[PDB]
Amino acid sequence: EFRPEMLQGKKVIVTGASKGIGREMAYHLAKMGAHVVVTARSKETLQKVVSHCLELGAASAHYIAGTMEDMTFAEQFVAQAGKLMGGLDMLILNHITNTSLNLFHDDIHHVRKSMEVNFLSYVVLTVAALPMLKQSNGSIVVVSSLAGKVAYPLVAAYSASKFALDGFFSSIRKEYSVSRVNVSITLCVLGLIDTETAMKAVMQAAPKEECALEIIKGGALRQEEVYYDSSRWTTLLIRNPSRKILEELYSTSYN
Amino acid sequence: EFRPEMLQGKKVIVTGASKGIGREMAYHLAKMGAHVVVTARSKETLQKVVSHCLELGAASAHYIAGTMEDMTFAEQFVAQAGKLMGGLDMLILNHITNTSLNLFHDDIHHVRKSMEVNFLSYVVLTVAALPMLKQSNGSIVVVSSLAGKVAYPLVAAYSASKFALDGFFSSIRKEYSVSRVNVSITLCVLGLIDTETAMKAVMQAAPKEECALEIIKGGALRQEEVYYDSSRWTTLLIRNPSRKILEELYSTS
Ligand SMILES: NC(=O)c1ccc[n+]([C@@H]2O[C@H](COP(=O)([O-])OP(=O)(O)OC[C@H]3O[C@@H](n4cnc5c(N)ncnc54)[C@H](OP(=O)(O)O)[C@@H]3O)[C@@H](O)[C@H]2O)c1
Ligand SMILES: NC(=O)c1ccc[n+]([C@@H]2O[C@H](COP(=O)([O-])OP(=O)(O)OC[C@H]3O[C@@H](n4cnc5c(N)ncnc54)[C@H](OP(=O)(O)O)[C@@H]3O)[C@@H](O)[C@H]2O)c1
Numbered sequence: 001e002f003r004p005e006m007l008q009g010k011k012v013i014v015t016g017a018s019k020g021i022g023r024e025m026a027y028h029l030a031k032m033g034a035h036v037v038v039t040a041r042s043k044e045t046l047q048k049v050v051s052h053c054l055e056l057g058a059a060s061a062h063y064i065a066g067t068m069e070d071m072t073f074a075e076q077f078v079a080q081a082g083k084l085m086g087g088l089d090m091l092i093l094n095h096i097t098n099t100s101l102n103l104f105h106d107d108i109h110h111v112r113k114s115m116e117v118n119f120l121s122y123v124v125l126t127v128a129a130l131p132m133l134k135q136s137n138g139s140i141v142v143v144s145s146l147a148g149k150v151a152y153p154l155v156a157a158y159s160a161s162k163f164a165l166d167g168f169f170s171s172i173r174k175e176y177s178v179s180r181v182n183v184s185i186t187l188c189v190l191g192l193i194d195t196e197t198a199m200k201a202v203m204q205a206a207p208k209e210e211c212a213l214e215i216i217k218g219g220a221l222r223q224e225e226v227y228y229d230s231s232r233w234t235t236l237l238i239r240n241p242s243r244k245i246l247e248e249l250y251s252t253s254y255n
Numbered sequence: 256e257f258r259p260e261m262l263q264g265k266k267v268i269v270t271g272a273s274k275g276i277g278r279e280m281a282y283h284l285a286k287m288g289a290h291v292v293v294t295a296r297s298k299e300t301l302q303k304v305v306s307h308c309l310e311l312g313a314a315s316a317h318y319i320a321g322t323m324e325d326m327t328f329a330e331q332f333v334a335q336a337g338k339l340m341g342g343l344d345m346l347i348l349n350h351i352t353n354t355s356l357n358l359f360h361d362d363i364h365h366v367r368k369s370m371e372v373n374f375l376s377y378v379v380l381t382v383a384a385l386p387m388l389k390q391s392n393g394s395i396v397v398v399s400s401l402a403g404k405v406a407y408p409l410v411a412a413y414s415a416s417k418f419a420l421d422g423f424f425s426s427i428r429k430e431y432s433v434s435r436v437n438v439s440i441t442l443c444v445l446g447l448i449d450t451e452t453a454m455k456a457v458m459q460a461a462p463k464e465e466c467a468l469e470i471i472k473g474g475a476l477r478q479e480e481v482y483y484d485s486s487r488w489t490t491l492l493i494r495n496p497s498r499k500i501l502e503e504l505y506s507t508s
């Protein structure tokens with residue numbers, strides 16, 4: 001049911017687009033002829049991405065460098081991006097703070113930083129974007145992980161942040177349903193992807209290029225969840241039908 | 256296989272014990288003859304709770320009033336509590352910041368406060384308690400909710416904080432398994448309970464007295480999860496076998 005034309009002329013923010021899945025998403029949106037605003041801390045890598053976007057046939061491509069540790073930057077970023085495109089059709093929240101695979105001892109500053117960059121900054125970006133997304137009847141895409149659905153050692157702070165995104169966005173999705181806010185929320189559950197970050201930090205990784213295209217497709221098709229894993233078995237097990245029943249058994253009782 | 260005597264003479268911290276489930280847990284541990292240290296913001300209420308604990312037959316009962324927004328208080332409390340009892344056998348993390356069941360608009364300070372009180376403070380308390388819990392081969396009890404497993408409207412910040420507890424504690428449980436740290440982690444998934452807080456905020460809720468005894472029982476029996484709900488049907492639906500399989504799929508390795 002997805003057609004690349006669905007993205008032609010669309011106004012899209014992609015966070016964490018200097019590298020990995022983010023950079024790949026920005027390139028796919030460009031090949032489809034969308035207006036893209038990209039961000040990361042690194043100005044020079046961002047520049048290279050923006051020019052390559054214009055080479056692929058993007059309607060427009062821009063960058064705004066900054067840290068998502070700074071909540072005022074998150075706020076002002078959406079404002080300038082919106083100004084550049086004259087509005088916003090899709091918000092792709094994808095960035096993450098640097099983490100290493102390590103046992104948890106006492107790094108409370110690291111738990112805080114992850115919670116700030118990976119979680120609160122997503123909430124702050126959403127609040128800022130919500131008036132524009134309401135106008136266009138837009139979409140919010142939240143890039144999560146299997147580590148944000150299930151428990152693995154070595155990723156406690158990261159898992160906590162990804163789990164937090166599920167609780168927050170999944171609850172606001174129920175609120176938008178009742179409030180009749182026509183803004184879709186897509187949560188992406190990915191397994192290990194072949195990004196240079198992941199490859200160095202860590203089985204069989206899945207291709208970054210297809211992963212990127214799937215995230216966009218899911219968002220465009222207004223899906224609640226998107227699954228992307230190198231295994232058939234893992235994808236079958238990602239789904240939580242009891243959760244759905246539990247959730248739906250409340251709504252079909254009060255609403 | 257639970258016996259009340261398993262708690263006799265045991266050293267236990269109970270957070271959020273001025274009211275609700277927390278206060279009830281503190282009373283149950285008191286009837287079993289345990290050493291209890293209780294905490295909350297409310298000093299005059301904690302006093303009344305402590306004296307009632309000693310009336311029920313607690314080996315000792317003490318309190319330390321303070322706010323879990325303050326991370327240094329969280330740190331200081333565990334040392335102070337650990338000094339009072341000469342060690343720690345069980346850590347019951349139960350407190351929550353005040354929330355109302357409203358639609359989310361733009362209250363970022365509220366998302367932050369919930370994340371700090373309901374989540375960060377639990378992590379800070381754990382880090383502080385871990386050396387003592389290692390000595391006794393202790394237990395950490397994390398009080399969560401169904402709203403921390405499943406999605407409901409009107410509780411976004413609260414859900415985020417409860418979901419975060421699951422990811423963090425469930426991952427550290429895997430780390431303690433590989434590191435061979437003999438400290439158990441119990442996550443409690445509760446439905447509505449008949450506490451004044453809940454009866455004011457939001458409805459056939461489950462009794463707080465039995466809820467309180469179950470949390471303790473689960474912790475004592477070193478269970479990974481504890482379920483407590485007024486519905487048998489809901490209870491059946493809480494288990495996630497696919498998650499378990501995905502988790503163990505990795506383990507080997
Ligand atoms: N790769 C996998 O195996 C995998 C698996 C499951 C889920 N995911 C999820 O997929 C998403 C993309 O990950 P990825 O593999 O593409 O990782 P990545 O290559 O490390 O990309 C992270 C991006 O965030 C940026 N960033 C870092 N710190 C930042 C900060 N403080 N403020 C703003 N931006 C910051 C990075 O660039 P700068 O350094 O230029 O700031 C980069 O553009 C993440 O949400 C991740 O959790 C990935
Ligand atoms: N009752 C339910 O329907 C329900 C449902 C699911 C899960 N649960 C879980 O069960 C636990 C107990 O809930 P409850 O209904 O018994 O709630 P409660 O009566 O409101 O008790 C929460 C406790 O936390 C303390 N507290 C509040 N803000 C604090 C702060 N900033 N710093 C330190 N302590 C603070 C309160 O004391 P002060 O104001 O004196 O500080 C109180 O003793 C929670 O983890 C809750 O999520 C309950």
Ligand SMILES: CCCSc1nc(N2CCC[C@@H](CC(=O)O)C2)ccc1C(=O)NC1CCCCC1
Binds near residue numbers: 101158203204230231
């Ligand atoms: C012990 C590794 C935990 S991290 C992690 N584990 C995942 N598992 C466990 C290993 C096998 C794997 C198999 C699969 O693809 O089905 C599924 C899947 C995704 C992540 C993840 O999002 N990793 C981050 C870490 C920080 C940097 C970004 C990437």
Ligand SMILES: CCCSc1nc(N2CCC[C@@H](CC(=O)O)C2)ccc1C(=O)NC1CCCCC1
Binds near residue numbers: 356409413447
């Ligand atoms: C829409 C209400 C969401 S709050 C909430 N809902 C729960 N549900 C939804 C209603 C029906 C209920 C039925 C059940 O027992 O199976 C299951 C269960 C627990 C909570 C909860 O943790 N409550 C907190 C809120 C803040 C104050 C402290 C208590």
